[PDB]
């Protein structure tokens, strides 16, 4: 059982919408320290890891911890009309139901039946970029290919792609307001699938500060924060 309240329904819905792009349903583990969710996409190419600590909620009480199955698509629809300033309440008693309340101009509560749902990497590069850069870079690349190569060096982050004819190169340095930070341990190179990145960055926000870590022909870790303490992390297998 538990009653959890997050202030900013719209923002919570977007977090959930970002996750629904890769996965359809997931198990949310509610403990006293926060909510966490972890799942792999159908094709086993992308892992999504979400962590929302209690400090991000205006109210957080968990009498007895528990895991609940959730269909992201169904949750998505329910949260669709939550507004930017609406209050969101997630409450569960002993029964197998989830009570979702969206409180703003009125108090709207949904009762939805719950359904059960059943290795540190040595990244040699890290960059922090404005979500707009990834969103634009992925669409640019899609115009010429289904593959995009990530290249990182000191003060230089490069994403490039090339198809049967045209090619595109998106480059950033610290002078660019698109690159917020760069820490490279050595020239790092790896390639990834444009479609997967497209789904990963779709829900991404234009001004969100995204962190990216990867290694040579190694998967890429992509994360961005929620109310500073929250975190949504993507782990994407490479196109070696």
């Amino acid at each position: 059982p538990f009653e959890i309240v997050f202030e900013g329904a719209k923002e919570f819905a977007q977090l959930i919408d970002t996750a629904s792009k890769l996965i359809d349903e997931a198990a949310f583990k509610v403990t006293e320290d926060g909510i966490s969710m972890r799942a792999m996409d159908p094709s086993r190419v992308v892992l999504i890891d979400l962590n929302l600590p209690s400090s991000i909620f205006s109210k957080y009480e968990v009498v007895e911890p528990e895991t609940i199955g959730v269909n992201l698509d169904h949750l998505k629809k329910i949260l669709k009309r939550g507004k930017a300033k609406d209050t969101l309440i997630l409450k569960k008693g002993e029964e197998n139901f989830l009570e979702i309340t969206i409180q703003g101009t009125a108090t709207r509560t949904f009762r939805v039946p719950l359904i059960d749902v059943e290795p540190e990497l040595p990244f040699t590069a890290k960059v922090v970029v404005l979500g707009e850069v990834l969103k634009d870079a992925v669409k640019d690349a899609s115009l010429v290919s289904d593959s995009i190569k990530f290249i990182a060096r000191e003060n230089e982050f490069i994403m490039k792609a090339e198809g049967e004819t045209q090619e595109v190169e998106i480059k950033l340095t610290l002078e660019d307001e698109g690159l917020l930070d760069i820490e490279v341990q050595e020239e790092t190179k790896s390639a990834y699938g444009v479609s997967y990145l497209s789904d990963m960055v779709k829900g991404l926000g234009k001004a969100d500060e995204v962190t990216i870590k990867f290694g040579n022909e190694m998967p890429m870790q992509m994360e961005y924060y929620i109310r500073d303490e929250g975190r949504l992390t993507f782990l994407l297998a490479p196109r070696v």
Binding site: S43, P219, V240
Partner: peptide, 8 residues
């Protein structure tokens, strides 16, 4: 080829 997370 597109590798799987299972490869790492």
């Amino acid at each position: 080829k597109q590798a799987t997370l299972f490869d790492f």
